[PDB]
Amino acid sequence: EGVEKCIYQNNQIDLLEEYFEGETSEHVVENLSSKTLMLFKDEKEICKRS
């Protein structure tokens, strides 16, 4: 009757449950970027060359 009392209390709510435990953001908005790595170019040419 003393243990039955303690079983009852712990059976009310899990109390250790973590809401959305483990599972990550999943779908996340990713903006489309374009990183310019390196420019090439001619040096001291007569006019510009396309």
């Binding site: 003393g2 243990v3 039955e4 303690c6 079983i7 009852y8 712990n10 059976n11 899990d14 250790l16």
Partner: protein
């Protein structure tokens, strides 16, 4: 009459097993689902030490005169829950589960 309580304890939602101990350490009565005599001798040695150690420590190492331990609730991984009480000389160790593990145990039975 004294058997009906063992039947009443398995009836409580979550309850896997129980094991009762004398002041000695002998197990008086255990469940059939938890191992009989083999584990009951093993599970007595741990809790009788854990109790007598904690009983001792609270009266001395906390420096609180006249404050005896009443319950101990070891909560664990999975959903096990080891409840230790003491009525008079005798003690006992119930084992309950939670909704998740109860549901798992019912599915295993099914």
């Amino acid at each position: 009459n004294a058997d009906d309580q063992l039947k009443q304890l398995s009836a409580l939602e979550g309850a896997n097993g129980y094991v009762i101990f004398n002041e000695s350490g002998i197990p008086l009565k255990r469940h059939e689902k938890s191992i009989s005599h083999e584990k009951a001798v093993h599970i007595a040695a741990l809790v009788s030490d854990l109790w007598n150690v904690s009983k001792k420590v609270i009266q001395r190492d906390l420096k609180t005169p006249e404050n005896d331990i009443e319950v101990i609730r070891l909560r664990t991984k999975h959903s096990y829950e080891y409840i230790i009480t003491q009525s008079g000389d005798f003690t006992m160790l119930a084992i309950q589960l939670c909704g998740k593990a109860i549901e798992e145990a019912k599915k295993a039975a099914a």
